[PDB]
Amino acid sequence: MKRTWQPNRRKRAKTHGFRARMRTPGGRKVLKRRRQKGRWRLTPAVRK
Amino acid sequence: AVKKFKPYTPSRRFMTVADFSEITKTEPEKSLVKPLKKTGGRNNQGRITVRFRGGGHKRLYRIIDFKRWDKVGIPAKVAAIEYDPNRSARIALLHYVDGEKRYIIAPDGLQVGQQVVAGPDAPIQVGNALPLRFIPVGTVVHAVELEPKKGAKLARAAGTSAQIQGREGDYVILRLPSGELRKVHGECYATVGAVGNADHKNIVLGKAGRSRWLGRRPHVRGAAMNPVDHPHGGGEGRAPRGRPPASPWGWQTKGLKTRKRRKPSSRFIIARRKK
RNA sequence: CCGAGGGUAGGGCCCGUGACUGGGGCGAAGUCGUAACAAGGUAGCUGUACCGGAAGGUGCGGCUGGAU
RNA sequence: UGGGAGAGGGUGGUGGAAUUCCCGGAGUAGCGGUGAAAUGCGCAGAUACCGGGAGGAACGCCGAUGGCGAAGGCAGCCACCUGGUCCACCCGUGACGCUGAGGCGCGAAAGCGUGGGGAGCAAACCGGAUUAGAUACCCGGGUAGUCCACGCCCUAAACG
RNA sequence: CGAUGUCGGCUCGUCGCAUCCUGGGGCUGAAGAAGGUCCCAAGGGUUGGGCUGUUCGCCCAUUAAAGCGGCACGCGAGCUG
RNA sequence: GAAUGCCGGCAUGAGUAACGAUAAAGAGGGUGAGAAUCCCUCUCGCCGUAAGCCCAAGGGUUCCUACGCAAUGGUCGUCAGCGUAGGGUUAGGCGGGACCUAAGGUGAAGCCGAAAGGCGUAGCCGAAGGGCAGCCGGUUAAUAUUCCGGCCCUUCCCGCAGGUGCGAUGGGGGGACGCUCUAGGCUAGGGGGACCGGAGCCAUGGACGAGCCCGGCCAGAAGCGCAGGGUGGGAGGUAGGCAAAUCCGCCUCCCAACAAGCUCUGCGUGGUGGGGAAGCCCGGGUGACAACCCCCCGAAGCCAGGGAGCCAAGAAAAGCCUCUAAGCACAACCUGCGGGAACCCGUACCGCAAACCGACACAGGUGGGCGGGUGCAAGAGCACUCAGGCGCGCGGGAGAACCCUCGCCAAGGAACUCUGCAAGUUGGCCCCGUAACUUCGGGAGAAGGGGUGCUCCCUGGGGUGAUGAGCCCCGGGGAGCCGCAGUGAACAGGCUCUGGCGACUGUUUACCAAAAACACAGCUCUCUGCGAACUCGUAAGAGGAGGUAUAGGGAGCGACGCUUGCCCGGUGCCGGAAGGUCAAGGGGAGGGGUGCAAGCCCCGAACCGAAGCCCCGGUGAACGGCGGCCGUAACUAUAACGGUCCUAAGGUAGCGAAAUUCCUUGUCGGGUAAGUUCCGACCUGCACGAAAAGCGUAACGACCGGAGCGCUGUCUCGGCGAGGGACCCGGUGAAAUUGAACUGGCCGUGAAGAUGCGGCCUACCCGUGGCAGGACGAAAAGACCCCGUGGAGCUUUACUGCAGCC
RNA sequence: GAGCUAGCCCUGGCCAGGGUGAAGCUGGGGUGAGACCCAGUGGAGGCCCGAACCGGUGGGGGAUGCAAACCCCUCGGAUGA
Ligand SMILES: CC(C)C[C@@H]1CCO[C@@H]2[C@H](CN[C@@H]2C(=O)N[C@H]2[C@H]3O[C@H](SCC/C=C\[C@H]2C)[C@H](O)[C@@H](O)[C@H]3O)C1
Ligand SMILES: [K+]
Ligand SMILES: [Mg+2]
Ligand SMILES: [Mg+2]
Ligand SMILES: [Mg+2]
Ligand SMILES: [Mg+2]
Ligand SMILES: [Mg+2]
Ligand SMILES: [Mg+2]
Ligand SMILES: [Mg+2]
Ligand SMILES: [Mg+2]
Ligand SMILES: [Mg+2]
Ligand SMILES: [Mg+2]
Ligand SMILES: [Mg+2]
Ligand SMILES: [Mg+2]
Ligand SMILES: [Mg+2]
Ligand SMILES: [Mg+2]
Ligand SMILES: [Mg+2]
Ligand SMILES: [Mg+2]
Ligand SMILES: [Mg+2]
Ligand SMILES: [Mg+2]
Ligand SMILES: [Mg+2]
Ligand SMILES: [Mg+2]
Ligand SMILES: [Mg+2]
Ligand SMILES: [Mg+2]
Ligand SMILES: [Mg+2]
Ligand SMILES: [Mg+2]
Ligand SMILES: [Mg+2]
Ligand SMILES: [Mg+2]
Ligand SMILES: [Mg+2]
Ligand SMILES: [Mg+2]
Ligand SMILES: [Mg+2]
Ligand SMILES: [Mg+2]
Ligand SMILES: [Mg+2]
Ligand SMILES: [Mg+2]
Ligand SMILES: [Mg+2]
Ligand SMILES: [Mg+2]
Ligand SMILES: [Mg+2]
Ligand SMILES: [Mg+2]
Ligand SMILES: [Mg+2]
Ligand SMILES: [Mg+2]
Ligand SMILES: [Mg+2]
Ligand SMILES: [Mg+2]
Ligand SMILES: [Mg+2]
Ligand SMILES: [Mg+2]
Ligand SMILES: [Mg+2]
Ligand SMILES: [Mg+2]
Ligand SMILES: [Mg+2]
Ligand SMILES: [Mg+2]
Ligand SMILES: [Mg+2]
Ligand SMILES: [Mg+2]
Ligand SMILES: [Mg+2]
Ligand SMILES: [Mg+2]
Ligand SMILES: [Mg+2]
Ligand SMILES: [Mg+2]
Ligand SMILES: [Mg+2]
Ligand SMILES: [Mg+2]
Ligand SMILES: [Mg+2]
Ligand SMILES: [Mg+2]
Ligand SMILES: [Mg+2]
Ligand SMILES: [Mg+2]
Ligand SMILES: [Mg+2]
Ligand SMILES: [Mg+2]
Ligand SMILES: [Mg+2]
Ligand SMILES: [Mg+2]
Ligand SMILES: [Mg+2]
Ligand SMILES: [Mg+2]
Ligand SMILES: [Mg+2]
Ligand SMILES: [Mg+2]
Ligand SMILES: [Mg+2]
Ligand SMILES: [Mg+2]
Ligand SMILES: [Mg+2]
Ligand SMILES: [Mg+2]
Ligand SMILES: [Mg+2]
Ligand SMILES: [Mg+2]
Ligand SMILES: [Mg+2]
Ligand SMILES: [Mg+2]
Ligand SMILES: [Mg+2]
Ligand SMILES: [Mg+2]
Ligand SMILES: [Mg+2]
Ligand SMILES: [Mg+2]
Ligand SMILES: [Mg+2]
Ligand SMILES: [Mg+2]
Ligand SMILES: [Mg+2]
Ligand SMILES: [Mg+2]
Ligand SMILES: [Mg+2]
Ligand SMILES: [Mg+2]
Ligand SMILES: [Mg+2]
Ligand SMILES: [Mg+2]
Ligand SMILES: [Mg+2]
Ligand SMILES: [Mg+2]
Ligand SMILES: [Mg+2]
Ligand SMILES: [Mg+2]
Ligand SMILES: [Mg+2]
Ligand SMILES: [Mg+2]
Ligand SMILES: [Mg+2]
Ligand SMILES: [Mg+2]
Ligand SMILES: [Mg+2]
Ligand SMILES: [Mg+2]
Ligand SMILES: [Mg+2]
Ligand SMILES: [Mg+2]
Ligand SMILES: [Mg+2]
Ligand SMILES: [Mg+2]
Ligand SMILES: [Mg+2]
Ligand SMILES: [Mg+2]
Ligand SMILES: [Mg+2]
Ligand SMILES: [Mg+2]
Ligand SMILES: [Mg+2]
Ligand SMILES: [Mg+2]
Ligand SMILES: [Mg+2]
Ligand SMILES: [Mg+2]
Ligand SMILES: [Mg+2]
Ligand SMILES: [Mg+2]
Ligand SMILES: [Mg+2]
Ligand SMILES: [Mg+2]
Ligand SMILES: [Mg+2]
Ligand SMILES: [Mg+2]
Ligand SMILES: [Mg+2]
Ligand SMILES: [Mg+2]
Ligand SMILES: [Mg+2]
Ligand SMILES: [Mg+2]
Ligand SMILES: [Mg+2]
Ligand SMILES: [Mg+2]
Ligand SMILES: [Mg+2]
Ligand SMILES: [Mg+2]
Ligand SMILES: [Mg+2]
Ligand SMILES: [Mg+2]
Ligand SMILES: [Mg+2]
Ligand SMILES: [Mg+2]
Ligand SMILES: [Mg+2]
Ligand SMILES: [Mg+2]
Ligand SMILES: [Mg+2]
Ligand SMILES: [Mg+2]
Ligand SMILES: [Mg+2]
Ligand SMILES: [Mg+2]
Ligand SMILES: [Mg+2]
Ligand SMILES: [Mg+2]
Ligand SMILES: [Mg+2]
Ligand SMILES: [Mg+2]
Ligand SMILES: [Mg+2]
Ligand SMILES: [Mg+2]
Ligand SMILES: [Mg+2]
Ligand SMILES: [Mg+2]
Ligand SMILES: [Mg+2]
Ligand SMILES: [Mg+2]
Ligand SMILES: [Mg+2]
Ligand SMILES: [Mg+2]
Ligand SMILES: [Mg+2]
Ligand SMILES: [Mg+2]
Ligand SMILES: [Mg+2]
Ligand SMILES: [Mg+2]
Ligand SMILES: [Mg+2]
Ligand SMILES: [Mg+2]
Ligand SMILES: [Mg+2]
Ligand SMILES: [Mg+2]
Ligand SMILES: [Mg+2]
Ligand SMILES: [Mg+2]
Ligand SMILES: [Mg+2]
Ligand SMILES: [Mg+2]
Ligand SMILES: [Mg+2]
Ligand SMILES: [Mg+2]
Ligand SMILES: [Mg+2]
Ligand SMILES: [Mg+2]
Ligand SMILES: [Mg+2]
Ligand SMILES: [Mg+2]
Ligand SMILES: [Mg+2]
Ligand SMILES: [Mg+2]
Ligand SMILES: [Mg+2]
Ligand SMILES: [Mg+2]
Ligand SMILES: [Mg+2]
Ligand SMILES: [Mg+2]
Ligand SMILES: [Mg+2]
Ligand SMILES: [Mg+2]
Ligand SMILES: [Mg+2]
Ligand SMILES: [Mg+2]
Ligand SMILES: [Mg+2]
Ligand SMILES: [Mg+2]
Ligand SMILES: [Mg+2]
Ligand SMILES: [Mg+2]
Ligand SMILES: [Mg+2]
Ligand SMILES: [Mg+2]
Ligand SMILES: [Mg+2]
Ligand SMILES: [Mg+2]
Ligand SMILES: [Mg+2]
Ligand SMILES: [Mg+2]
Ligand SMILES: [Mg+2]
Ligand SMILES: [Mg+2]
Ligand SMILES: [Mg+2]
Ligand SMILES: [Mg+2]
Ligand SMILES: [Mg+2]
Ligand SMILES: [Mg+2]
Ligand SMILES: [Mg+2]
Ligand SMILES: [Mg+2]
Ligand SMILES: [Mg+2]
Ligand SMILES: [Mg+2]
Ligand SMILES: [Mg+2]
Ligand SMILES: [Mg+2]
Ligand SMILES: [Mg+2]
Ligand SMILES: [Mg+2]
Ligand SMILES: [Mg+2]
Ligand SMILES: [Mg+2]
Ligand SMILES: [Mg+2]
Ligand SMILES: [Mg+2]
Ligand SMILES: [Mg+2]
Ligand SMILES: [Mg+2]
Ligand SMILES: [Mg+2]
Ligand SMILES: [Mg+2]
Ligand SMILES: [Mg+2]
Ligand SMILES: [Mg+2]
Ligand SMILES: [Mg+2]
Ligand SMILES: [Mg+2]
Ligand SMILES: [Mg+2]
Ligand SMILES: [Mg+2]
Ligand SMILES: [Mg+2]
Ligand SMILES: [Mg+2]
Ligand SMILES: [Mg+2]
Ligand SMILES: [Mg+2]
Ligand SMILES: [Mg+2]
Ligand SMILES: [Mg+2]
Ligand SMILES: [Mg+2]
Ligand SMILES: [Mg+2]
Ligand SMILES: [Mg+2]
Ligand SMILES: [Mg+2]
Ligand SMILES: [Mg+2]
Ligand SMILES: [Mg+2]
Ligand SMILES: [Mg+2]
Ligand SMILES: [Mg+2]
Ligand SMILES: [Mg+2]
Ligand SMILES: [Mg+2]
Ligand SMILES: [Mg+2]
Ligand SMILES: [Mg+2]
Ligand SMILES: [Mg+2]
Ligand SMILES: [Mg+2]
Ligand SMILES: [Mg+2]
Ligand SMILES: [Mg+2]
Ligand SMILES: [Mg+2]
Ligand SMILES: [Mg+2]
Ligand SMILES: [Mg+2]
Ligand SMILES: [Mg+2]
Ligand SMILES: [Mg+2]
Ligand SMILES: [Mg+2]
Ligand SMILES: [Mg+2]
Ligand SMILES: [Mg+2]
Ligand SMILES: [Mg+2]
Ligand SMILES: [Mg+2]
Ligand SMILES: [Mg+2]
Ligand SMILES: [Mg+2]
Ligand SMILES: [Mg+2]
Ligand SMILES: [Mg+2]
Ligand SMILES: [Mg+2]
Ligand SMILES: [Mg+2]
Ligand SMILES: [Mg+2]
Ligand SMILES: [Mg+2]
Ligand SMILES: [Mg+2]
Ligand SMILES: [Mg+2]
Ligand SMILES: [Mg+2]
């Protein structure tokens, strides 16, 4: 049947993207946290 | 005269529709329509604040002239009577000798080709607008301002009217469509006559689908719900109210008055509605 | 081919009969009240409507076939 | 052809008396009701009195043993639309008449449908009396209804 | 109670005997035929259906007879539900 | 050494289950160390409204080629979507951007919030909507509306010519719109041709034929033609379109009007440029100077912004045209022609799937377009087929039980069972014919029946064309032929009677409930006079509503019909300027501490003092509630009647052993041979009853009862047959479980149900196919039950707070 | 976190074929005029049959599955809430 992951590049960028994260105190702490941990990707990769 | 249907479906048996016999023009005036942003009952938070709204037919909003003292002395001709999906009354298209075109809500008995005018000097005729202080006591009136220059506020629904009861100082005394006796300032404008389309009240929607067309989503009884949802929720099997009948939010709903007590306009309500 | 009739299916009319139920007639001395006939003790009757163990009562309108 | 009388019918308007409720005044110890009472109402200011407002219904005197209509029935006043009818003249048509199974229409009250309206009155219903009882008569309340529009009902001591 | 699946049916049997039938008997208020009652006997047999989820029970039509009980009220790693 | 401990390794189950749709394979020839599995050929089967083709998303090199086979591939592998390497994606016109706006988002001004932040007009952003200029063919191993060829077109810059009051982010027009139905003319697409072009073919009894087989087009500028869409012209006044306006709007006058004209699309033709089959021969070449024509069918597509009707009344903004404003009129704009200029991103490949979402090369899920022919009434249904694509990545045998899916069955025909569950039966079209009841629509496909193929003969009407022929579409009558059978295959209702519940179509527990539950039109109560009530928010601000009592919120009831009784004492709600109580505050009789004293400081009675509560009324489609005992009639029995106690009042109409009745399978009647169910009655209703509505009700129902007909493998009662498994051989090879095991029966014993203890009995060692009685078999630290001063959801006249409101 | 699911908002798209035959309109009849009747035309509807599409009624299979909800047969809706 229809499953829960239905990929959509525009949805992915507008929801989890770098510019969505910077617009918000909570989103900015995510970027801060993921940098401190040393993540190679701060944000999901989307083709655009 | 509401129109009936032969019972050739279960729903056509009781469905009635307006006769639309007063209507003379069947597409609106392009310079006077703007899009009507449907809300679905949602506020600017996105939250539902009025339950059970949405999914009705698409509509354009017809700009209506609720001042009319905008154009004192300038007569106008009645060019058309049209359907308005945003109100129960019909609307009347006015061609001013100015060249300006405007909509008013159509009073009972108005005729295409007759002329209407507004001002202190206007003939006491159907369709004319005067300040309340110049209209003879006893005249049936509609589209009544509540405060001067603030816009017609009272008696706008199909078939309604207010009646001038008397004068006291700078104020006239009106019997509102509800039967309330109120003092309204004499400078307030009002239009001679009752609102038309008085057969509106006798339309039988006929089926559930017809409520969906009007943007009315199904209404769920409190007694059909669970206690998480409603004071009347729950119980094994059916259940009486078991408490004073209440709204979803806990307040009582069979008699509890809710007009704010210390309201400044109380000084101007003579007698509350009856019946 | 038609054809007595036999078969299948579905209708119409009549008769008999049926747990139970509805009122009706009748029946020497049952129980309750007293509606009508006297202004019958609230004049009567009336079509209708509502109510009441029961006769009845009451409303609306009509009639005199009502009295003084 | 010329005239007449009439609550004949339909539509719209509009006038005063009274009842009720509301507001203002003034005023105090009761009011109301009956055969007698009680219920009820009233010092939270009733009743009685004056001024003001709102609303509905019915039209006093004229009024009669009267008038009109086929009947049911029709009563303030005004305008408009409309029916029947009688008299005068003796002018026109030339028996064109009478009745009338069916049919069609009208048809008091009550009642029914959808709206409206609702002062007074009042089935049901409540209470107070009475009574052996009193699902009555009498008293205090009172909802349909009574009123308007449209549509049904089609009855009668619809009787001379 | 870190699970011994629970009513009834179906299927499949197997056992007990306090025996429903059939076999052998004594007594009879056993003329005969048919019964009653007790004793011996478990080899075999012990029907079809209407009603109800029913077990049970009642009823219809038969029968030599239409037995009662145990097996985790036998049997859900066999079925049903 | 134990923690259902943690991490890792390795066992057991086991050469076991399985190897992923039952669309299906066989052989020959290649290649190679090796071949059922790779390549080629022939034969066979499967899809064909797809299992073919083309877009979009998503994926991201998977594409093409060479070289490879460790691992990946459920087997094999020489093959591959795999490993290595090289190559491959070309645009002014296709899509997106340098254009426009939608919801929404953001947000100069402004508003609000302890901070973070929340709002917000314009503006901006935002598309699969609006706007905008490319069609056909060829070419590569792999791209192509992109390269090439042919014929076309757009914008920007500059210049030349001609014209004009030029000029805008401002005014106006336009853009610009629904649903159903639908005209005319066309195109796409299709069928036929005795015509035109073609390599050939004559078989096996016959045919050298008006034979068979194959094909018979595509694109195209101006012009022209056919069909449509859009659009009145002139003048005079003018105060409206937030400046102006010669534009638009409004008034008057003249002319035009199913027209015409002007304009804009579509289709046809059109210079020209392309394509072009079978068969044969090795993707190619030939065929070929290919032919390229007539007739019929015909769109849901096109003309289009077409027409009609209906009510629920159907985006915006830019491009565009017109008007003027500053400005400028040596400019600028319009028209024509010429030269020049024309950027960024995407483009490979998969795409109903082995490349996307499902951990898998997973019987699942995934939006748009094309989707041929014949026959069956039609159709996208069904069967067979074209183009094209596949045989589903383990096979070979055997022909047991048993399982699945399927076919048939003597006699009977529901006897099966909780239940006709399941499976039969019925089945399309045409014709005849069709009941109670009904809201007059329906019930209705009621029920029940007849017809159905093929041949010959005569004949009616329509479309096209020409009025005719031809082709095509609807029919009518007569005479015959064959079979068991003519919707001869495939797709395609079993029916009736009678109850309960719900009026109805709808909606629901994604994944055990589709229902009688929810909703529903409709009815009633209630709140709300507008800065409405109410809702969300600390607020600002929103929704309500750009609505205004014929409206909006809340509540119950639930089409419709006939109805909806009595009780206001308690609770709620509504009214009530009195009286009672009442907090802060006011008041200050009167005290007290301290000081030598002026003073400073403290306590403080009466009395004034809100809402609320008490109190007085009202109110039931507000919460709710609507009796007991005893007696009595000239047979008995039973009580219309009476007595008395209690209540705020004592259940009315209607219904009743019921979706409610305990005793109960009540009693009686009906149906049956037999009826705990069913239907109709009765009424001592344990414990119906009137909007948590009462009693009915045509129609409707994958709801739940009861009965009958039809027909059946449901059954008596089972039998045979088919295929997929099971079984055997070759290949690959799991799992939960597992203290160790050398693991028998009876009667006992034992923590009370023993392979393991006692006594006896029985038993050579090891497997394979089967069956499930035991191992208190497995699974899951019982969900029932209790316990824990464990948890959570929910209620309230439990306690205590808080929001909100007064 | 609403790329699942629930509701709403904006903008698009889809629903083979066949059946039934409302209003209205025209004509005829009728009448004082009417209502109304008949025929034809017409093409309404939470109308009917049935694909796509959307569902999930009954049964069977599946149950270390093809599948952490699937498969076969059957069944509901299919111009509308
Ligand atoms: C009167 C009655 C209440 C007595 C009661 C009967 C109920 O059960 C029995 C209790 C006694 N214990 C039994 C029980 O727990 N049984 C479990 C089963 O669960 C499934 S069987 C399907 C579920 C059924 C039963 C469960 C409760 C597993 O496979 C089985 O192994 C078994 O654990 C008694
Ligand atoms: K329990
Ligand atoms: Mg889903
Ligand atoms: Mg999605
Ligand atoms: Mg995207
Ligand atoms: Mg996207
Ligand atoms: Mg998105
Ligand atoms: Mg989305
Ligand atoms: Mg976001
Ligand atoms: Mg972002
Ligand atoms: Mg911050
Ligand atoms: Mg920060
Ligand atoms: Mg790095
Ligand atoms: Mg992140
Ligand atoms: Mg109707
Ligand atoms: Mg109208
Ligand atoms: Mg506009
Ligand atoms: Mg709004
Ligand atoms: Mg917003
Ligand atoms: Mg709400
Ligand atoms: Mg809403
Ligand atoms: Mg409105
Ligand atoms: Mg309107
Ligand atoms: Mg005012
Ligand atoms: Mg209404
Ligand atoms: Mg609407
Ligand atoms: Mg509603
Ligand atoms: Mg509801
Ligand atoms: Mg509930
Ligand atoms: Mg519930
Ligand atoms: Mg919640
Ligand atoms: Mg709570
Ligand atoms: Mg609650
Ligand atoms: Mg409750
Ligand atoms: Mg409940
Ligand atoms: Mg209950
Ligand atoms: Mg419930
Ligand atoms: Mg209660
Ligand atoms: Mg409450
Ligand atoms: Mg409140
Ligand atoms: Mg009021
Ligand atoms: Mg015979
Ligand atoms: Mg009397
Ligand atoms: Mg008497
Ligand atoms: Mg008398
Ligand atoms: Mg008397
Ligand atoms: Mg009485
Ligand atoms: Mg006093
Ligand atoms: Mg009044
Ligand atoms: Mg004469
Ligand atoms: Mg009458
Ligand atoms: Mg009394
Ligand atoms: Mg007495
Ligand atoms: Mg009254
Ligand atoms: Mg008389
Ligand atoms: Mg246990
Ligand atoms: Mg365990
Ligand atoms: Mg266990
Ligand atoms: Mg003897
Ligand atoms: Mg024996
Ligand atoms: Mg039994
Ligand atoms: Mg038992
Ligand atoms: Mg029993
Ligand atoms: Mg036993
Ligand atoms: Mg026992
Ligand atoms: Mg058992
Ligand atoms: Mg089981
Ligand atoms: Mg069992
Ligand atoms: Mg077991
Ligand atoms: Mg076991
Ligand atoms: Mg230890
Ligand atoms: Mg361990
Ligand atoms: Mg552990
Ligand atoms: Mg571990
Ligand atoms: Mg581990
Ligand atoms: Mg290691
Ligand atoms: Mg390990
Ligand atoms: Mg290992
Ligand atoms: Mg092994
Ligand atoms: Mg094994
Ligand atoms: Mg396995
Ligand atoms: Mg497998
Ligand atoms: Mg298949
Ligand atoms: Mg198969
Ligand atoms: Mg072969
Ligand atoms: Mg082979
Ligand atoms: Mg091989
Ligand atoms: Mg090999
Ligand atoms: Mg193969
Ligand atoms: Mg090959
Ligand atoms: Mg061969
Ligand atoms: Mg095909
Ligand atoms: Mg992937
Ligand atoms: Mg390999
Ligand atoms: Mg290999
Ligand atoms: Mg190898
Ligand atoms: Mg592998
Ligand atoms: Mg695999
Ligand atoms: Mg090799
Ligand atoms: Mg390697
Ligand atoms: Mg490539
Ligand atoms: Mg190009
Ligand atoms: Mg640029
Ligand atoms: Mg923009
Ligand atoms: Mg954006
Ligand atoms: Mg944009
Ligand atoms: Mg776009
Ligand atoms: Mg483009
Ligand atoms: Mg082109
Ligand atoms: Mg090359
Ligand atoms: Mg090409
Ligand atoms: Mg528009
Ligand atoms: Mg649009
Ligand atoms: Mg519509
Ligand atoms: Mg063409
Ligand atoms: Mg064809
Ligand atoms: Mg001007
Ligand atoms: Mg050549
Ligand atoms: Mg289409
Ligand atoms: Mg179009
Ligand atoms: Mg806009
Ligand atoms: Mg100059
Ligand atoms: Mg010009
Ligand atoms: Mg640039
Ligand atoms: Mg490409
Ligand atoms: Mg698929
Ligand atoms: Mg593929
Ligand atoms: Mg996942
Ligand atoms: Mg595969
Ligand atoms: Mg797949
Ligand atoms: Mg073809
Ligand atoms: Mg067919
Ligand atoms: Mg295969
Ligand atoms: Mg397949
Ligand atoms: Mg395979
Ligand atoms: Mg074998
Ligand atoms: Mg055979
Ligand atoms: Mg048979
Ligand atoms: Mg039978
Ligand atoms: Mg039979
Ligand atoms: Mg049976
Ligand atoms: Mg059996
Ligand atoms: Mg059942
Ligand atoms: Mg049954
Ligand atoms: Mg069939
Ligand atoms: Mg019948
Ligand atoms: Mg009939
Ligand atoms: Mg019947
Ligand atoms: Mg019936
Ligand atoms: Mg009928
Ligand atoms: Mg028929
Ligand atoms: Mg038939
Ligand atoms: Mg025939
Ligand atoms: Mg034949
Ligand atoms: Mg024959
Ligand atoms: Mg069928
Ligand atoms: Mg239903
Ligand atoms: Mg239901
Ligand atoms: Mg019902
Ligand atoms: Mg009903
Ligand atoms: Mg439906
Ligand atoms: Mg479920
Ligand atoms: Mg569930
Ligand atoms: Mg679930
Ligand atoms: Mg299920
Ligand atoms: Mg359920
Ligand atoms: Mg259902
Ligand atoms: Mg529900
Ligand atoms: Mg309903
Ligand atoms: Mg109702
Ligand atoms: Mg109402
Ligand atoms: Mg709030
Ligand atoms: Mg708040
Ligand atoms: Mg705050
Ligand atoms: Mg607004
Ligand atoms: Mg509401
Ligand atoms: Mg209903
Ligand atoms: Mg409901
Ligand atoms: Mg009826
Ligand atoms: Mg009370
Ligand atoms: Mg009270
Ligand atoms: Mg009370
Ligand atoms: Mg009570
Ligand atoms: Mg109670
Ligand atoms: Mg009654
Ligand atoms: Mg009973
Ligand atoms: Mg009952
Ligand atoms: Mg009961
Ligand atoms: Mg019991
Ligand atoms: Mg019982
Ligand atoms: Mg019982
Ligand atoms: Mg019995
Ligand atoms: Mg019987
Ligand atoms: Mg039952
Ligand atoms: Mg009894
Ligand atoms: Mg209730
Ligand atoms: Mg109840
Ligand atoms: Mg019914
Ligand atoms: Mg019915
Ligand atoms: Mg249903
Ligand atoms: Mg159903
Ligand atoms: Mg039956
Ligand atoms: Mg069998
Ligand atoms: Mg076989
Ligand atoms: Mg062997
Ligand atoms: Mg092997
Ligand atoms: Mg392997
Ligand atoms: Mg293992
Ligand atoms: Mg050991
Ligand atoms: Mg050992
Ligand atoms: Mg052993
Ligand atoms: Mg052993
Ligand atoms: Mg023991
Ligand atoms: Mg033992
Ligand atoms: Mg042993
Ligand atoms: Mg041992
Ligand atoms: Mg020992
Ligand atoms: Mg031993
Ligand atoms: Mg031993
Ligand atoms: Mg032994
Ligand atoms: Mg073996
Ligand atoms: Mg074995
Ligand atoms: Mg076993
Ligand atoms: Mg077992
Ligand atoms: Mg066991
Ligand atoms: Mg154990
Ligand atoms: Mg066991
Ligand atoms: Mg488990
Ligand atoms: Mg634990
Ligand atoms: Mg435990
Ligand atoms: Mg557990
Ligand atoms: Mg549970
Ligand atoms: Mg316990
Ligand atoms: Mg405790
Ligand atoms: Mg403790
Ligand atoms: Mg606790
Ligand atoms: Mg919690
Ligand atoms: Mg808690
Ligand atoms: Mg707080
Ligand atoms: Mg978030
Ligand atoms: Mg979503
Ligand atoms: Mg969504
Ligand atoms: Mg459809
Ligand atoms: Mg169609
Ligand atoms: Mg038909
Ligand atoms: Mg017709
Ligand atoms: Mg028409
Ligand atoms: Mg339908
Ligand atoms: Mg299913
Ligand atoms: Mg079935
Ligand atoms: Mg499962
Ligand atoms: Mg399936
Ligand atoms: Mg199927
Ligand atoms: Mg259907
Ligand atoms: Mg359809």
mmCIF file of C-alpha atoms (C1' of nucleotides) in Angstrom, chain F residues 44-59:
data_model
loop_
_atom_site.group_PDB
_atom_site.id
_atom_site.type_symbol
_atom_site.label_atom_id
_atom_site.label_comp_id
_atom_site.label_asym_id
_atom_site.label_seq_id
_atom_site.Cartn_x
_atom_site.Cartn_y
_atom_site.Cartn_z
ATOM 1 C "C1'" C F 44 5.369 -23.513 -29.079
ATOM 2 C "C1'" G F 45 2.798 -20.397 -25.423
ATOM 3 C "C1'" C F 46 1.491 -15.249 -22.738
ATOM 4 C "C1'" C F 47 -0.037 -9.601 -22.665
ATOM 5 C "C1'" G F 48 -2.323 -6.467 -26.179
ATOM 6 C "C1'" U F 49 -7.322 0.258 -22.277
ATOM 7 C "C1'" A F 50 -1.073 -3.803 -21.769
ATOM 8 C "C1'" A F 51 2.431 -7.062 -19.507
ATOM 9 C "C1'" G F 52 2.795 -1.853 -25.752
ATOM 10 C "C1'" C F 53 4.092 3.684 -26.428
ATOM 11 C "C1'" C F 54 4.753 8.868 -24.641
ATOM 12 C "C1'" C F 55 5.016 12.912 -20.401
ATOM 13 C "C1'" A F 56 5.388 14.268 -15.007
ATOM 14 C "C1'" A F 57 7.465 13.096 -10.012
ATOM 15 C "C1'" G F 58 11.112 10.429 -7.650
ATOM 16 C "C1'" G F 59 15.981 7.948 -8.701
#
